[PDB]
């Protein structure tokens, strides 16, 4: 049996609101932070995890519910970001020249992706439509594509001479690459380090929220240029002191989780649905 997917739910416009649920969502869910190593370095502590946990307890979350996680930086977190955890808040420090990789990480974790494998050395690969991308993750993802015409001969590049291949993203830990949809391609991607998946983009992973810490709003989650929507799960707070940032988070946690949702969680901590 389905859960009732194709059955309508007749409601009403006079039923009275059921009462609050903040208490129950606190007592069930688990809040969870992803912060850079710079945060701990500037805090210069090591009971700060305990202090923040007790602050969250006073705010109304039971003890074993707030889990802190540490990543070296944005680009290195981008390599297979496994959100091992229920309500995800990714604190993310802005610095120049990280605009694109920061945006790519935000896209990857905010949206749900259905990823299939790709065998680069053997087959050519297209992109079906607007919602499909190629996501390449690893230690050194240099991607060089050669598009083929109707005659299986490359255009602007010969399939034999890899130098003529058009490089589309060099030396990123994560690269979400789009190419014109409907052309076969030959990819030269460094198979020892980097792995590349053909990923469709389903709806939004409406569980993880991204808190930018530095500059102006720049996260273009939608790769299409005509639209730059602003999701309520993309927050932006100025800063000088990481302690002030964490106190702001702890003080306003209720609003943040009210913005986020719990139902959109997956059994796997992976940030995509691998469908072989």
């Amino acid at each position: 049996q389905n859960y009732g997917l194709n059955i309508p739910i007749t409601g009403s416009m006079d039923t009275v609101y059921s009462n609050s649920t903040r208490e129950e969502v606190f007592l069930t869910s688990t809040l969870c932070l992803y912060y850079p190593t710079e945060a701990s370095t500037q805090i210069s502590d090591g009971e700060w995890k305990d202090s923040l946990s007790q602050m969250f307890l006073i705010k109304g979350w039971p003890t074993g519910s707030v889990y802190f996680k540490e990543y070296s930086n944005i680009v290195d977190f981008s390599v297979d970001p496994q959100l091992y955890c229920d309500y995800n808040l990714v604190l993310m420090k802005y610095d120049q020249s990280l605009e694109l990789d920061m945006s790519e990480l935000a896209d990857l974790i905010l949206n749900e992706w259905l990823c299939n494998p790709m065998d680069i050395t053997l087959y050519y690969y297209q992109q079906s439509g607007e919602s499909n991308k190629w996501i390449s993750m690893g230690s050194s993802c240099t991607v060089k594509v050669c598009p083929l015409n109707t005659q299986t001969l490359g255009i602007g590049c010969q399939t034999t001479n890899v130098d003529s291949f058009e490089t589309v993203a060099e030396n990123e830990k994560l690269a979400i690459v789009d190419v014109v949809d409907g052309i076969n391609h030959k990819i030269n991607l460094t198979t020892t380090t980097c792995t590349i998946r053909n990923c469709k983009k389903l709806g939004p992973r409406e569980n993880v929220a991204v808190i930018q810490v530095g500059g102006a709003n720049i996260l273009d989650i939608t790769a299409d240029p005509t639209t730059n929507p602003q999701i309520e799960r993309m927050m932006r707070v100025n800063w000088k002191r990481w302690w002030q940032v964490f106190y702001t988070i702890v003080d306003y946690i209720n609003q943040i989780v009210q913005v986020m949702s719990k139902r959109s969680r997956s059994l796997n901590s992976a940030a995509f649905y691998y469908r072989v």
Partner: protein, 48 residues
């Protein structure tokens, strides 16, 4: 002080001639076999 004079050759009396060694240089080409199973040759495969 002997019969044999003005003979062309090189006797074995003192061939070194006070030299530590006679030297020769050149190029040295070789086409010998070798086992290379590291290829495991069936990659030239037709990508399709």
């Amino acid at each position: 002080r002997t019969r044999t004079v003005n003979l062309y050759g090189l006797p074995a009396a003192n061939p070194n001639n006070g030299n530590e060694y006679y030297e020769i240089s050149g190029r040295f080409s070789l086409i010998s076999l070798v086992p290379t199973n590291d290829d495991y040759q069936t990659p030239i495969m037709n990508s399709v």
